Amino acid sequence: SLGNVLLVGLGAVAIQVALDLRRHGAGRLGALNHPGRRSQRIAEALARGACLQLEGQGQHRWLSGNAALDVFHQDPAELRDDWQTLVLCVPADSYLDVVRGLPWERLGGVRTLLLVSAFIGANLLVRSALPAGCQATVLSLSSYYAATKVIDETQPLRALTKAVKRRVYLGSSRPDCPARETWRRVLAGSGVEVVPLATPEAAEGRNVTTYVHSPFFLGEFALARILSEQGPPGFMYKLYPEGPITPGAIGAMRRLWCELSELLRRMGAEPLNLLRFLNDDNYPVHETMLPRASIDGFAEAGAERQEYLLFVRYAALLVDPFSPADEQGRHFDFSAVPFRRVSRDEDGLWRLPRVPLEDYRKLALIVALAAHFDLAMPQARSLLASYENAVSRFIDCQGASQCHPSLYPIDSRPAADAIYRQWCS
Amino acid sequence: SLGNVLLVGLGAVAIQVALDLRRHGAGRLGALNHPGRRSQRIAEALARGACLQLEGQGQHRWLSGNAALDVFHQDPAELRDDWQTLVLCVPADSYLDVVRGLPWERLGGVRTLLLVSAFIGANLLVRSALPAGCQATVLSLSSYYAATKVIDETQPLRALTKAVKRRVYLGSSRPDCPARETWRRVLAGSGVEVVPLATPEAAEGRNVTTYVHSPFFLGEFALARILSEQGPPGFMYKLYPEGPITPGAIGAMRRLWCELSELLRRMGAEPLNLLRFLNDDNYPVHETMLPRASIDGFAEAGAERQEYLLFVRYAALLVDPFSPADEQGRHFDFSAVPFRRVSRDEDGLWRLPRVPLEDYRKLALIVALAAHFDLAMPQARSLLASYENAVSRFIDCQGASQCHPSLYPIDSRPAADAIYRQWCS
Ligand SMILES: NC(=O)c1ccc[n+]([C@@H]2O[C@H](COP(=O)([O-])OP(=O)(O)OC[C@H]3O[C@@H](n4cnc5c(N)ncnc54)[C@H](OP(=O)(O)O)[C@@H]3O)[C@@H](O)[C@H]2O)c1
Ligand SMILES: NC(=O)c1ccc[n+]([C@@H]2O[C@H](COP(=O)([O-])OP(=O)(O)OC[C@H]3O[C@@H](n4cnc5c(N)ncnc54)[C@H](OP(=O)(O)O)[C@@H]3O)[C@@H](O)[C@H]2O)c1
Ligand SMILES: O=C(O)CC[C@H](N[C@@H](CCN[C@@H](Cc1cnc[nH]1)C(=O)O)C(=O)O)C(=O)O
Ligand SMILES: O=C(O)CC[C@H](N[C@@H](CCN[C@@H](Cc1cnc[nH]1)C(=O)O)C(=O)O)C(=O)O
């Protein structure tokens, strides 16, 4: 049912996906990776006999396996009409560009396009770039279902998965789509539970980083760490002054969740119970910190209780409460995830890490889209402004000539308009 | 003047107080401590020429000094009518025993008696135990004004002070009492502001330990650590599962503060703003964690907001947010105070540590007193019952034969009746 599968963007995600596809059963496996150093390293490794190699860490060792790459391309114009399924394993900010760059008028054999990390509107954005009469079904996965990295860029096709998510969601541009079940089974081989939902936006609306990264890593504290050069980087999930979590950040989280939930309703998607989603889909805590009744009742609890509960959740996860205690009674320091910070690239230009650049770009699109539904998203706009002000001051200080253009101002209104047009179609 | 001053109890508190008294000066300084291993070590140290030594830790190093003791008694029979001021540095739950045991027939010259760590009703209880026609004024200090420990009990006269309160409160059984100003000056020598209040109970209602230890260390989690032998002891101010602080513990804190505040009103004393008291008088946090407007408005904020704010306060103090950051951006682990646990005494009998035996005995007396004001104090009673159940099960398991009688049910009603009769006189 998968046929021959083309992986677009041959990185960590694609290597995990490739092994899951091979466990399930598929035809030929191809990849498209745009030009660059990574593609050069891949092409030499393949010439020397390399295959895609996945290692599962620790209790995920059973994931480990090898898979042959049958075809490798860098240039979309060079694709033959030999692919039934495309899997987009590139950054989600690149989905539109990827789709616009493919020669769809001679890819009539493509039946399915899977978006692995679909933001709100991604399915619609992708469909707006397809030619009229294109028969491809577009699938939206709520987020990548694991934690995977290419360990060593010198062995470019060897990836390590260190964790697998509990649950993700899958929606389709085709009503009551059958490709959902096939991909539900494929990804279930990794241990993740895939929950099919009735529309793409219902799955896109269950992208966790939209709700968590936006309030915490677009605020003043996080940006000060991220843009800093000297001193310790600070910690992503600790409380102030060690990390960015404050009652104000939790208030931003609640208000943004309200804003996102109303957008989802206006797009025809049921929103989520934030506290239950975080506890049950991501990381749980004990009943004495978050009682089950408080978790299940969160959406009706009232703003003060909701903020208290969210603050309790993140305080309860400063350590992993289910980890073994050490001889001193301490639990694993779960919150001590260091901030990645700005770094100069090979051209000497300052670049931002994916946290927060990808998070800012996603939220900028969501706000622009929401405007079409007559939703102002003031909390979201405040977070966008915080990022923009901080990055602008960094450019002022370092000099535009020293900064990569991804730091410069963007405009998401054209993509938002394309999404809205597609949705009204 | 203070005249000649007799310290009753010569432990960590007494050593700090002795330093402050010697700075102020002008009297003989004596001490009385009941017989036992500590008194034996004290007499040995003094006989070899030792003096009282107070060291300040870190920021408090400026306080460090030495204080000479003129006389030390471990036999009240040797006391004569030489003393104008008595300073009770014994545990607050022993005040009644200690006042009954003093040789009052040879102490007719005593003009003032200071309770260094009072609690609601302590002044009245002590006055009820004085001989008829005794005209010593009794002073109640709200809380001991520092954190002080005897470092090494083989050097019983050397103490370490690691914290000093910003503010404490002082009441007197004499209206418009002039001794309050004297003690204001004495304590000011170590940097503490003493605020005189118009009655003893107003000061006693500002005993910090009563508000904090009752909800946190009479609960299930704390008692399980305290009555354990084998585990790691856990930490007094950490969140579950490393420590006892949970939203339920915070709810108990809020509800007890309400109950205690009503008792204070019925005794003609103004209650406190719990959050402002904790932040401003004891240990502060940053405005981004506790905004000044939230602190000042706490008493009118409503139960949900009050509980959220108290939780945030204790989560913000898991580290000392004003301590210097280390190389990795971490602050001092302020909450890592280990629980002291049960231990066998020199007769082989299990004894409870002062946390929570002293805290239980204080709250039991307060509840018994409140019944005379027709206040049931259900939250306080739930905390008493939690302690009683846990200790009862420990006796069940270990055997009554093996337990010191201090672990057994007590009757606070006689002392509460004496307090109430004294108040009504
Ligand atoms: N655990 C995870 O790995 C994880 C988890 C959650 C979310 N995500 C997100 O998933 C996305 C991919 O993650 P990843 O870890 O697989 O990244 P990766 O290892 O760097 O792989 C991305 C691959 O796609 C190539 N690429 C980028 N843009 C392309 C384009 N327009 N057309 C063709 N190829 C393109 C990249 O080549 P170049 O390097 O030359 O650009 C690279 O080979 C990222 O946005 C990531 O933030 C990943
Ligand atoms: N930072 C602090 O130290 C601190 C903090 C908060 C509150 N407090 C309050 O201050 C009180 C004393 O604290 P501390 O640290 O000075 O204790 P400590 O170092 O143990 O000294 C207490 C002194 O009183 C004697 N004592 C104990 N129980 C007695 C009893 N039933 N009858 C007669 N004498 C007794 C003790 O001698 P033996 O050891 O021989 O009995 C010792 O000399 C605490 O109980 C508490 O009410 C102190
Ligand atoms: O967030 C990062 O960039 C890297 C950590 C990453 N986060 C998840 C979102 C959920 N984050 C936890 C908090 C937490 C995770 N680890 C310590 N604390 C929460 O919000 O409940 C993601 O990105 O999808 C992961 O869990 O692997
Ligand atoms: O045993 C220690 O070191 C502490 C001893 C002592 N405790 C006070 C109660 C207040 N406790 C702090 C919280 C805290 C203190 N130290 C770490 N956290 C708070 O509730 O605001 C007492 O016993 O009355 C002191 O702080 O002086």
Identify the experimental approach: X-ray
**Chain A touched by B237 (CB under 8 Å):** no
Cα–Cα distance measured from residue A184 to residue A170, given in angstroms and rounded to the nearest whole number: 8
Q: Whose CA is closest to atom 23 on ligand 4?
A: B209
Query: Which residues have C-beta within 8 Å of that of residue A242, sequence separation ≥ 6?
Result: A234, A235, B319, B325, B329, B330, B331
Closest CA of chain A from B160, distance in Å? 24
Is-contact B357 B371, C-beta < 8 A?
Answer: no
Region label for A175, one of left (φ > 0), alpha (ψ between -120 and 50) or beta (otherwise): beta
Nearest to B232 among A288, A315, A329 (CB): A329
Q: What's the reported resolution, in angstroms, to a tenth?
A: 1.6
Q: How many CB atoms lie within 10 A of CB A376?
A: 11
Q: What is the DSSP-derived secondary structure letter of residue A206? A: T
Q: Are A59 and A191 in contact (CB under 8 A)?
A: no
Helices (H), A147-244: 179-188, 200-204, 208-217, 220-226
Residue whose pair of structure tokens reads 């905390």 in the numeric block:
B383
Question: How far off is chain B from A380, nearest CA to CA, in Å?
Answer: 20
The candidate with the shortest Cα–Cα distance to B145, out of B113, B191, B185, is: B191
Give CA–CA dist A236/A318, Å, rounded. 10
Continuous segment of H or E residues that includes residue A147: strand A146-150
Closest-CA residue in chain B for A310?
A: B308
- What is the DSSP code string of A116-139? TTPPTTHHHHHHHTSPTT---EEE
- Report yes or no: B207 and B118 within 8 Å, Cβ to Cβ: yes
Contact B171, B204 (CB under 8 A): yes
Q: Do A328 and B304 make contact, defined as CB atoms within 8 angstroms?
A: no
Going from the Cα of A390 to the center of ligand 3, the distance in angstroms, rounded, reads 23
| CB-based contact, B286 to chain A, within 8 Å | yes
Quick check: CB of B317 below 6 Å from ligand 4? yes
Token pair 């009757």 is found at: B411
Across the interface, do A234 and B286 touch by the CB < 8 Å criterion? no
Q: Does B305 touch chain A (CB under 8 A)?
A: yes
Q: DSSP label at A166? A: S
Of residues A312, A251, A298, A252, the one with CA closest to residue B307: A312
- Using an 8 Å Cβ cutoff, are B186 and B145 in contact? no
Q: Pairing mode, if any, of strands B193-196 and B167-172?
A: parallel
Contact present, B252 and B284 (Cβ < 8 Å)? no
Which positions in chain A touch B233 (Cβ < 8 Å)? 329
8 Å CB contact of B240 and A307: no
The Cα A152–Cα A159 span in angstroms is 8
Contact, B171 vs B123, CB < 8 A? yes
From chain B, the residues in CB contact with A312 under 8 A are 247, 311
B113 Cα to the center of ligand 2, angstroms:
17
**E strands of A218-362, at which residues?**
343-344, 350-351
Helices A354-372 and A247-266, axial angle in degrees (round to 10): 40
A305 CA distance to ligand 4 middle (Å): 28
Nearest CB among B234, B242, B286 relative to A319 is that of B242
Parse chain A into domains and list their residue ranges.
Answer: 1-205, 206-425
Nearest chain B residue to A326 by CA: give it.
Answer: B232
**Alpha-carbon distance A54 to A13, whole Å?**
10
The closest residue, in CA terms, to atom 24 on ligand 4 is B209
Contacts of A80 (CB under 8 A, 6+ apart): none
Residue A272: closest CA among A283, A258, A285? A258
Amino acid at A240: Y
- Flag if A246 and B289 touch (Cβ within 8 Å): yes
CA trace torsion B82, B86, B91, B92 (10° rounding)? 140
**Catalytic residue list of B:** 213
Give phi and psi for B348, each to the nearest 5.
Answer: 80, 10
CA distance B22 to B165: 20
Whether the CB-CB separation of B215 and B383 falls below 8 Å is answered with yes
B338 CB neighbours in chain A (<8 A) are 329
Ligand 4 center–CA B164 separation, angstroms: 11
Distance CA B144, CA B116 (A): 6
Task: Say if residue B34 carries a ligand binding annotation.
Answer: yes
Instruction: Please list the residues that pair with B148 across neighbouring strands.
Output: B161
Distance from CA of A63 to the nearest CA of B (A): 32
CB-CB under 8 Å, B331 with A247: no
Q: Identify the burial level of B385 via C-beta atoms within 10 angstroms of its C-beta, where 0-12 means exposed, 13-18 middle and 19 or more buried.
A: exposed
Sheet strands (E) in B255-388: 343-344, 350-351
Which chain B residue lies closest to A332 (C-alpha atoms)?
B242
Residues of A marked active site are found at 213
- Write the CA distances from B67 to A129, B14, B32, B62, B86, integer angstroms: 85, 11, 16, 15, 17
- B314: nearest CA partner in chain A: A315
Ligand-binding site membership of B358 (annotated): yes
Q: How far apart are CA B380 and CA B245, in angstroms?
A: 17
Which of A:314-333 have CB within 8 Å of B?
A: 315-316, 318-319, 321, 325-331
Give the position, in ligand 4's atom list, of the atom nearest the Cα of B313.
21
| A325: phi then psi, degrees, rounded to nearest 5 | -75, 145
Partner residue facing B242 (CB), from A231, A308, A329: A329
CB < 8 Å to B315, chain A: 239, 311, 315
For residues A355 and A340, what is the distance between their CA atoms, to the nearest angstrom?
8
Helix (H, G, I), strand (E, B) or coil at A423: helix
In the beta sheet, which residues pair with residue B239?
B245
Query: Structure tokens of B139?
Result: 């002073």
**Ligand at shortest distance from the CA of A323:** 3
- Burial tier of A419 (Cβ tally within 10 Å: 0-12, 13-18, 19+): buried
CB-CB contact of B217 with B319 (8 Å): no
Residues in chain B preceding a C-to-N separation beyond 2.5 angstroms (breaks): none
Residue A395 DSSP label? H
Backbone angles phi, psi at A26, to 5 degrees: -150, 175
Q: Which residues of chain A neighbour B321 with C-beta distances below 8 Å?
A: 240-241
Q: Which residue has the tokens 């007890």?
A: B256
Q: Using a 6 Å cutoff on CB, does residue A282 contact ligand 3?
A: yes
* Nearest residue (CA) to ligand 4, atom 2: B337
| Residue contacts between A and B (CB atoms, under 8 Å) | 88
CA distances from A177 to A137, A180, A423 (A): 9, 6, 18
- For B318, nearest residue in chain A (alpha carbons): A239
B315 in contact with ligand 4, CB cutoff 6 A: no
Among protein residues, the one with the nearest Cα to ligand 3's atom 27 is A147
Is the CB of A240 inside 8 Å of chain B's CB atoms? yes
Ligand 1 atom, smallest distance to A92 CA:
45
Ligand 2 center to B161 CA (angstroms): 15
Least Cα distance to B85 among B29, B15, B24 occurs for B29
Q: Among B168, B190, B213, B237, which residue has the most ligand 4 atoms within 8 Å of its CB, making it the best to mutate?
A: B237
Q: Which atom of ligand 3 is nearest to the CA of A313?
A: 21
3-class DSSP string for B151-217: CCCCCCCEEEEEEECCEEEEEECCCCCCHHHHHHHHHHCCCCEEEECCCHHHHHCCCHHHHHHHHHH
Residue nearest to atom 5 of ligand 3 (CA): A337
* Closest by Cα among B282, B154, B148 to B213: B282
Other beta carbons less than 10 A from residue B49's beta carbon: 6
Which residue in the block uniquely carries the two structure tokens 């760059």? A101
**Axis crossing angle, helix B179-188 with helix B12-24, rounded to the nearest 10:** 100
**Any chain A CB within 8 A of the CB of B242?**
yes
Is residue A301 left, alpha or beta, with left meaning phi > 0 and alpha meaning psi from -120 to 50? alpha
Ligand nearest to the CA of A165: 3
Whose CA is closest to A67, among A31, A38, A117? Answer: A31
Q: Where are the beta strands (DSSP E) in B89-136?
A: 112-115
State the Cα–Cα distance between residues B185 and B200, nearest whole angstrom: 19
Query: Best mutation site among A60, A207, A237 for ligand 3, i.e. most ligand atoms within 8 A of its Cβ?
Result: A237
Give how far B348 is from chain A: nearest CA, Å: 27
| Minimal CA separation from A247 to chain B, in Å | 6
Distance CA B281, CA B207 (A): 11
CA atoms within 13 A on the CB side of B407: 27
Residue B149 Cα to ligand 2 middle (Å): 10
DSSP 3-state of A236: coil
